[PDB]
Ligand binder design. Sequence first.
Ligand SMILES: [Cu+2]
Ligand SMILES: [Cu+2]
Length: 257
Amino acid sequence: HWGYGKHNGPEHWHKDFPIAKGERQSPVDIDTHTAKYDPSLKPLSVSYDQATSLRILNNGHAFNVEFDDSQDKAVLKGGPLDGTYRLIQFHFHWGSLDGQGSEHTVDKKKYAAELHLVHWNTKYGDFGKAVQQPDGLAVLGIFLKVGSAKPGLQKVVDVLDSIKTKGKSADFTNFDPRGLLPESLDYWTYPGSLTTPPLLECVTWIVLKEPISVSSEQVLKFRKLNFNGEGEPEELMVDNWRPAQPLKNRQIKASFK
Ligand SMILES: [Cu+2]
Ligand SMILES: [Cu+2]
């Protein structure tokens, strides 16, 4: 009823999810010149040392690498955040070509892909309760550009053959998400939403300024995935990104000058 095709893509989602035309939708274009430095922001605290990855799942729109979120094992704190946010899963959005794929844009520039590390606020007890709150989630977004390989991505790329089609999953233990981060934690932040239906306005977005580099071969493997289930007509899982939405009454803040 929703996807990324011609007939069910972003431009249609409002029919079933009227919040698509809401006041704090994501992604947005990040106008670097109009973002303002906020000296009172903190440094981000990314605490992933005890992360417990469990599984990787092709859900028909992306693949999610899922984590044990039943304890404070892999948490995000600081920055604009009040309290502790637990990592539940990460996934990517990517293009059919290297010139598109990201959801956020930077001065209208599209990156080849975007990584979303999804975290929920522990004050709300579980993910499903957190998405109903204005400060329920914190998503760390990281741009991908094509160049050198990202070594810490390779273990993800190499399991993708085992989850080609919608509904397939595979064990994915002992994966360290720290290997997906860039050097700098400088960031922009703003209040927004989930970027897939149900498009709930529950996200504090934290978008890193510094992209990571991945190789051609790595992104090419993303593009071999399928939106369809096994035994259905093959449709490559590409261009699974929502375009930039109106900023409306929001200001994007920068952690850096
Ligand atoms: Cu559907
Ligand atoms: Cu996402």
